[PDB]
RNA sequence: UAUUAAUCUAGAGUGUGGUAGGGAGUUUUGGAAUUUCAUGUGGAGCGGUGAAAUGCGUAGAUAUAUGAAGGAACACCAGUGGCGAAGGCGAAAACUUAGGCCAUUACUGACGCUUAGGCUUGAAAGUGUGGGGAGCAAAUAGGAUUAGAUACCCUAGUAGUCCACACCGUAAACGAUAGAUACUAGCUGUCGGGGCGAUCCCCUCGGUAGUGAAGUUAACACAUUAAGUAUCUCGCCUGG
RNA sequence: CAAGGAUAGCACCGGUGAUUGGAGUUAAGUCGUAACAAGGUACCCCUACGAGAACGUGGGGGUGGAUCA
C-alpha cells in the first residue's frame, strides 16, 4: 500500500510517484479498486485522481500502447 | 469562503462579539452580493439560489425575533442592495 | 494561490528549447510567476499518441492570481509546445498542511518498515505495532457537577433478587 | 451528573422530560438529566414528596449561570420502575384550562394529576381543597 | 404561555485552527473510439437467429496501415466510501461556489421548527428555432417459427438523436417512508477529522451495511443506521 | 322623484339536442393470451412512436423480482 498513509499528509499529487503506482496499477494499464491499492479511503481518492491525471498526462496509457 | 474575519471583528454590536445577529446578517448580505454576481455571470447555478433564499429568510426571521428580543439592536442591516 | 504545474511537451525534442518555450508559455500567466528554474529531466510517454513515442518532463512551481491560470490551461494545451498542463491546487482533493510536517519520523519509520529487510524480522507490511496510548485532544466535554444533594436515595444494585427459601 | 450529549433547548421542558422518562423505562436507564427548568424542579420535588421519585440534583458546568437538573427515576433494587407511564393534558399548542369545577379523579382516583394554577404546581386533589382550578399539565400514577 | 430592561448560553450559526469529499455553476485540453476520404494491397466472400432469409461483394467487397477528419461522449478508476436541497455526483485539470466534519472554555441573548403566500430546481423522454447528424434508432420495410408471431429472431432503415436558445415538469423522484426539535443498550468494522501512535491496534465526534434486548407491530419485521418516545407544522385516506 | 319602461354591444344563471366517449350491468359471443412461470420477455413507472388489441417499442428511473454467497 501507499507510503503516504504511513507518513501522514492527507493528500498526494503526481510528483512522478510511478513506482508506487506500479503497485496499484496492473501491467494492463487499468486501475485496480481500493482492495488492491490498500489505501484507506482518502488516499484512495487521491491515488484515483492521480492515476486519472496520469491517464490525461500520458504518464499511464488508457489502454493504447 | 468570501468573508469570515472582516465584518464580525471590525464591527462590535455589544462589548464583544464573535457571532451575533447583525454581524451574521452583514456577512450574509456580503455573500449574497457575491453569489448574485456569480449567478449573473453563470445563470445555471441553482444551489446558490436556494442558499440565498435560505440566507435571506433566516435573516428576516433573525430580525423579526430581535424586534421584541432587544429594544433596538437591528437597525443597521434590514434592507437589501440588489437593484 | 499556490500552483505547481506538471508539463507535457510535444513529442521528442531538445531539452533546452523545450524549457525556453515552456518559460514562454508560463509568460501567458499574467502574474502567476516566481518560478524556480528546474525540470524532471527526460521521461518518455509510455504509449504513442499517434506518432509521439516519447516526450520530456518539466515542473514549474510558483504562485499568483488563481483566476489567471485558466488562460494558461487554454494556451499551453492549445499551442503545440505543451500537451498537458497539470495544475495543483485546493480544488483537487486537498490534504496539505504547513504544521503536519512533524510527521516525517513516521516517514523514516515506514521507509524502514514498508518491507522488513532483515532476516530476523519479516513481519507483514500490514500488521499492528501497538505502543498504543490513545490520545484524543478532542472531546467536547462539559463539567457537570452536583451542588444540592436532596432526597438521599440511589439505585446501584438494580439486578433482581427474589425467590427465597423453597421446599 | 449528565448522561451524555447535554440536552439543548427543546420545544418545551415537559416534552423532553417525557422522552427522557420513556427512554429510561424502555432501554434500562436509571438516572436522566434535563435542561434547567423551574417547573421541572417543582415537579421533581413534588414527585419525591409523593414517594415515586429518587434523588434529584441541580447541576452546573464550569459556569453557574447555565444549569441543568438530573434525577434518578426511582428504581427498586429488583429492576422495577416507580413510574409506569405518563400523559400530558396541557400541550404547548393547546394549554387546556380547567377551573375548580373541572377537577375529577384520576381514572379511578388512584393516579396523580398536576396543575399549574397560580404559583408553582399543585395536585388536582389538593387544588380542589383550596377551590383552585387552573391548567392541568399531566396525569401520572 | 406572548412576554419587559437585563437576560443564562446548553442550540441557530458564528471569532478561530485542523479539515475530507466523484458536491456543484464555469472554463480548458488529452486519450482514443468510430466510420470514412487520398494510399495501395487481395482473391471470394459478408449478414444472422433454434436453423435461415432479408439485406451487402469482383466495376476489388472482408480486412489492412498510417495521414486527415465529423458529431459524440470518456473501459478501469467505483469502496461496512464520501460528498450530496431532491433529481444526483467518476478522462482529467483548474476559476468560482456550496455543503460540511472535527474541535473553539465564544458571542447576539435562544434570536429557531413547519409552511398559506411567494421563490427555486427538477432524471428522462420529446418540441419550435438555428446548426450538426458521427452513431444507433423506433414506426417499422423486407425476411424466420408461426394457427397469429402483430411481442419475443435477423438485416435495411428515417422520426428520433445531438449542440445552444425557448418549452419541457413528470419517474418505481423511493427510504414503497415530508419534515424540524429533544432523548434513548450495544456490537463486528469502516470512513472524515483531533489524533498519542511506521501505517497501526486504539479511540472523540459526525457518517457508513448489519445486528438484537427494551420498545414496536395485522404480520412482514424494524430497533439508538426504529416501523422507539415525546413537541410544532404542511400533504393525504375513510370500502372497492 | 318615484313604481313600471326601450333602442344597440356586452354580462349572469337554468335547461336542452343531431351524434358521441367513458363507467356499471349479459352461465355463455368474439382476436391472442400480452400479464400472472423469470408467462417465457424479469417486472413496473414516466415519457415517445405505431399495430385491430393485449401491448410492444426509444430513453431514463425503480424492486414491489431468480438461481444464489
Residues B79 and B25 sit within 8 Å (Cβ to Cβ): no
Alpha carbons D139 and D126: distance in angstroms, whole number: 14
The Å distance, CA of D115 to C1' of E161, is: 73
Question: So where are chain A's domains?
Answer: 1-65
- Name the residue range of residue C47's domain: 4-88
Sheet architecture: strand order including D122-123: D86-88, D135-140, D112-116, D122-123
Q: Check D57 against C157: CB less than 8 A apart.
A: no
Distance spanning both ends of chain D, measured CA to CA: 26
Task: From residue D32, give the alpha-carbon distance in Å to each of A41, C154, D84.
Answer: 39, 13, 16
User: What whole-number distance in Å separates Cα of residue D137 and Cα of residue C16?
Assistant: 88
- B18 is in which domain, residue-wise? 1-83
Decide if A19 touches C, using CB distance below 8 A. Answer: no
The rounded distance, in Å, linking the Cα atoms of B46 and C143 is 44
Residue length, chain B? 83
Neighbour subunits, A (≥3 Cβ pairs < 8 A): C
Helix (H) or strand (E) holding B55: helix B46-69
C139, C140, C141, C144: which to substitute to probe chain D, counting the most D Cβ within 10 Å?
C144
Q: To which residue does cell 466535554 refer?
A: C141
SS (H, E, C) chain D: CCCCCCCCCCCCHHHHHHHHHHHHHHCCCCEEEEECCHHHHHHHHHHHHHCCCCCEEEEECCCCCCCEEEEECCEECCCEECCCCEEECCCCCCCCECCHHHCCCCCCCCCEEEEECCCCCEEHHHHHHCCCCCEEEEEEC
SS3 A30: coil
Cβ within 8 Å of residue C49, ≥6 positions away: A58, C83
The rounded distance, in Å, linking the Cα atoms of C113 and C122 is 10
Angle made by CA atoms D94, D96, D98, in degrees to the nearest 5:
175
Q: Is C41 helix (H, G, I), strand (E, B) or coil?
A: coil
Domain count, chain B: 1
Resolution of this model in Å is 13.6
Per the document, the length of chain C is 167
Closest by CA to D48, choosing from D116, D112, D135, is D112
> Residue C22 belongs to a domain with what CATH number?
3.30.70.60
Residue with cell 423505562: D25
Q: In this complex, do A6 and C114 lie within 8 Å of one another by their Cβ atoms?
A: yes
- C130 CA to E161 C1' distance (Å): 61
Determination approach: cryo-EM
Q: Given an 8 Å threshold on Cβ–Cβ distance, is A53 in contact with C43?
A: no
> For C80, how many CA atoms within 13 A lie in the half-sphere containing its CB?
4
Amino acid at each position: 500500500y501507499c507510503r503516504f498513509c504511513a507518513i501522514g499528509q492527507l493528500r498526494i499529487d503526481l510528483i512522478d510517484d510511478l513506482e508506487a503506482l506500479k503497485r496499484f496499477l496492473s501491467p494492463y494499464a487499468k486501475i485496480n479498486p481500493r482492495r488492491i491499492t490498500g489505501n484507506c479511503q482518502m488516499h484512495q481518492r487521491h491515488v484515483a485522481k492521480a492515476l486519472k491525471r496520469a491517464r490525461y498526462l500520458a504518464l499511464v496509457p488508457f489502454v493504447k500502447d | 469562503q468570501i468573508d469570515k474575519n472582516g465584518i464580525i471583528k471590525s464591527a462590535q454590536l455589544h462589548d464583544k462579539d464573535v457571532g451575533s445577529i447583525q454581524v451574521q446578517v452583514s456577512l450574509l448580505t456580503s455573500q449574497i452580493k457575491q453569489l448574485t454576481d456569480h449567478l449573473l455571470a453563470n445563470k445555471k447555478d441553482f444551489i446558490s439560489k436556494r442558499g440565498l433564499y435560505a440566507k435571506v429568510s433566516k435573516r428576516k426571521r433573525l430580525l423579526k425575533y430581535l424586534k421584541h428580543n432587544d429594544l433596538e439592536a437591528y437597525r443597521n442591516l434590514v434592507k437589501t442592495l440588489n437593484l | 494561490m499556490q500552483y505547481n504545474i506538471i508539463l507535457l511537451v510535444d513529442g521528442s525534442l531538445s531539452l533546452e528549447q523545450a524549457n525556453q518555450v515552456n518559460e514562454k508559455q508560463q509568460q501567458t500567466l499574467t502574474n502567476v510567476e516566481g518560478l524556480q528554474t528546474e525540470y524532471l529531466g527526460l521521461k518518455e510517454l509510455a504509449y504513442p499518441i499517434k506518432k509521439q513515442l516519447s516526450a520530456h518532463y518539466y515542473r514549474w512551481k510558483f504562485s499568483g492570481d488563481n483566476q489567471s491560470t485558466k488562460d494558461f490551461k487554454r494556451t499551453a494545451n492549445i499551442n503545440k509546445q505543451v500537451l498537458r498542463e497539470l495544475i495543483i491546487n485546493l480544488e483537487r482533493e486537498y490534504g496539505y498542511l504547513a504544521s503536519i510536517n512533524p510527521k516525517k519520523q513516521q516517514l523514516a519509520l515506514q521507509k524502514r518498515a514498508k518491507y522488513d529487510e532483515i532476516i530476523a524480522r519479516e513481519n507483514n507490511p500490514e500488521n499492528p505495532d501497538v505502543p498504543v496510548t490513545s490520545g484524543l485532544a478532542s472531546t467536547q466535554p462539559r463539567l457537570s457537577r452536583t451542588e444540592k444533594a436532596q432526597k438521599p436515595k440511589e439505585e446501584l444494585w438494580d439486578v433482581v433478587q427474589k425467590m427465597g427459601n423453597f421446599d | 451528573i449528565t448522561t451524555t450529549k447535554p440536552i439543548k433547548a427543546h420545544f418545551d421542558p415537559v416534552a423532553d422530560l417525557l422522552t427522557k422518562i420513556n427512554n429510561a423505562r424502555k432501554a434500562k436507564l436509571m438516572t436522566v438529566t434535563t435542561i434547567a427548568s423551574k417547573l421541572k424542579i417543582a415537579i421533581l420535588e413534588i414527585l419525591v414528596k409523593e414517594g415515586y421519585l429518587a434523588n434529584f440534583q441541580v447541576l452546573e458546568n464550569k459556569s453557574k449561570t447555565k444549569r441543568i437538573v438530573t434525577f434518578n427515576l426511582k428504581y427498586t433494587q429488583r429492576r422495577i420502575p416507580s413510574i409506569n407511564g405518563v400523559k400530558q393534558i396541557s400541550k404547548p399548542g393547546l394549554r387546556i384550562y380547567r377551573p375548580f369545577e373541572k377537577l375529577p379523579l384520576v381514572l379511578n382516583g388512584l393516579g396523580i394529576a398536576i396543575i399549574s394554577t397560580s404559583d408553582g404546581v399543585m395536585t388536582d386533589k389538593v387544588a380542589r381543597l383550596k377551590k383552585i382550578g387552573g391548567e392541568i399539565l399531566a396525569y401520572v400514577w
